[PDB]
Design a protein around this ligand. Structure first.
Ligand SMILES: Cc1cc2nc3c(=O)[nH]c(=O)nc-3n(C[C@H](O)[C@H](O)[C@H](O)COP(=O)(O)OP(=O)(O)OC[C@H]3O[C@@H](n4cnc5c(N)ncnc54)[C@H](O)[C@@H]3O)c2cc1C
Length: 474
């Protein structure tokens, strides 16, 4: 008959889904689909933890569609070829999907839409992963924001959208329709191993829409009240752990905002009020970087500001390798890099410390780090990851005066008792917190733990010197 296809990408859930809800208001014969795109799966920048989480979200999505009344079609190959072909073989009334903010997703999308138009099939692309689309947040001159302050002021005043309905009572495809598309479908969802990946490090939140919704609710029912200042300490489990759920859309952005907003109204404590407002602003910061990537795609290429595109990066491979293997000799840095490679996630404060270290101390083009994070983070997200790294050098959006972190100061300030350090570096559990924080560990009491690969003070003078020299040469 007249079926509508909904194409899932970073919105692996049936609830609070803008494009999916819009599609259901047009037809009950709503068939979901996911395409295993080789340019994404085979990329050297794909993290095993991310594929594991992804695959897990899909397993649940298959069930959700089955329970709703239809199914989730699985495809493997090039999207602009396979999707139009599938829609045509199914005489699809339309193909729906939620818009991307990334260069690759957007280029692919324009190509799929054009192919659909040629075939005479409607393509509806709606905004779903942002509370406010990039086109809704503009300055008085109708231009995007490259400074957070003014962006936050606009974003904050905009009326917030609420969760949309979960589609129900769907009409599944018939055998004759299934025969028409048989050649384009995978019989079943490939396992992690079949895809050639392996992951056993766990997740910040179990895969799937259900687990994501449970975490959001558990966080907003208690821990969120102490977000500020518990968010600052890596040793403390004071954050939500929803990052991969937001990147892959296991949780909708409006459900998250609403749950936090309801907790704020329910709270009668000032401190709890503040903590919740702070968490909410985290979501605003997320949108700032996503809108930035949308408005200024060249950000993805590397250092944005002119001065930084010329910075003389030393690029000593040995130093980078030591960094990636947690063998830098700086406890707070190695404990963090170990948490990343072992669990596929890293506390935000630690991401800031290790990024600053790689860029300021090791003086390595931060792109090597941005790539290493993407190769390991279960929440690896271009907008946020690139935003985080441009930040380590003020080479992109919302720049700040030159500054260099001192691992020792950070460690003492955010891990004063060295609980997080000993947790991820158990072979140093015998050392005094004082020494793990300063990074000055006696050879005998250090065992096999390596000595500092660089002398912070000398690296700091070297970085500033290169900065001032180029600063002048311009
Ligand atoms: C160098 C560096 C790299 C980073 N890499 C990524 C990455 O690849 N993917 C990722 O989503 N985030 C990235 N972050 C941002 C951040 O550290 C995480 O979102 C955070 O660790 C997620 O933990 P959580 O879910 O418990 O966060 P919470 O504290 O519970 O915050 C809630 C949500 O807000 C968003 N968020 C919070 N902080 C920021 C921020 N700084 N920028 C953008 N979004 C934010 C996330 O979606 C997060 O799940 C990076 C930051 C830095 C400094």
């Amino acid at each position: 008959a007249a079926p509508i296809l909904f194409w899932h990408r970073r919105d692996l859930r049936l609830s609070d889904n803008i494009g999916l809800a819009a599609a259901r208001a047009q037809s009950a014969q709503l068939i979901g689909l996911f395409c295993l795109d080789p340019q994404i799966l085979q990329s050297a920048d794909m993290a095993p933890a991310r594929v594991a989480y992804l695959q897990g979200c899909l397993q649940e999505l298959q069930q959700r569609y089955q329970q709703a009344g239809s199914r989730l079609l699985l495809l493997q190959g090039d999207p602009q070829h396979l999707i139009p072909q599938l829609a045509q073989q199914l005489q699809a009334e339309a193909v729906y999907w939620n818009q991307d903010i990334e260069p690759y997703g957007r280029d692919r999308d324009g190509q799929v839409a054009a192919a659909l138009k040629t075939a005479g099939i409607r393509a509806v692309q709606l905004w779903d992963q942002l509370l406010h689309s990039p086109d809704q947040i503009l300055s008085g001159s109708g231009n995007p924001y490259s400074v957070y302050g003014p962006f936050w002021k606009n974003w904050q005043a905009q009326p917030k959208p609420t969760p949309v309905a979960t589609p129900t009572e769907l009409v599944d495809l018939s055998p004759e329709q299934l025969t028409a598309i048989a050649p384009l479908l995978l019989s079943e969802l490939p396992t992690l191993k079949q895809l050639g990946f392996d992951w056993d490090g766990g997740f910040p939140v179990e895969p799937g829409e259900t687990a994501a919704i449970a975490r959001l609710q558990e966080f907003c029912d208690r821990a969120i009240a102490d977000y500020d200042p518990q968010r600052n300490f890596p040793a403390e489990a004071g954050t939500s752990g929803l990052s991969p759920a937001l990147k892959f859309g296991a949780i909708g952005i409006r459900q998250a905002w609403q749950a936090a907003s309801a907790a704020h109204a329910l709270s009668r404590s000032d401190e709890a009020r503040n903590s919740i407002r702070v968490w909410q602003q985290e979501l605003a910061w997320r949108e700032f970087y996503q809108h930035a990537l949308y408005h200024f795609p060249s950000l993805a290429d590397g250092p944005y500001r002119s001065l930084w595109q010329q910075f003389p990066w030393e690029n000593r491979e040995a130093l980078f390798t030591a960094w990636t293997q947690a063998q830098t000799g700086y406890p707070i840095v190695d404990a963090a890099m170990r948490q990343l490679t072992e669990t596929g996630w890293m506390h935000n404060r630690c991401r800031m410390i290790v990024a600053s270290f790689l860029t300021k101390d090791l003086i390595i083009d931060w792109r090597r780090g941005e790539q290493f994070f993407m190769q390991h983070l279960v929440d690896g997200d271009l907008a946020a990851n690139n935003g985080g790294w441009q930040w380590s050098a003020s080479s992109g959006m919302d720049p700040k005066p030159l500054r260099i972190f001192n691992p020792a100061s950070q460690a003492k300030k955010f891990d004063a008792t060295a609980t997080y350090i000993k947790r991820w570096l158990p072979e140093l559990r015998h050392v005094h917190p004082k020494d793990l924080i300063s990074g000055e560990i006696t050879p005998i009491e250090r065992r096999g733990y390596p000595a500092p690969i660089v002398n912070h003070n000398l690296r700091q003078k070297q970085f500033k010197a290169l900065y001032n020299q180029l600063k002048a040469a311009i």
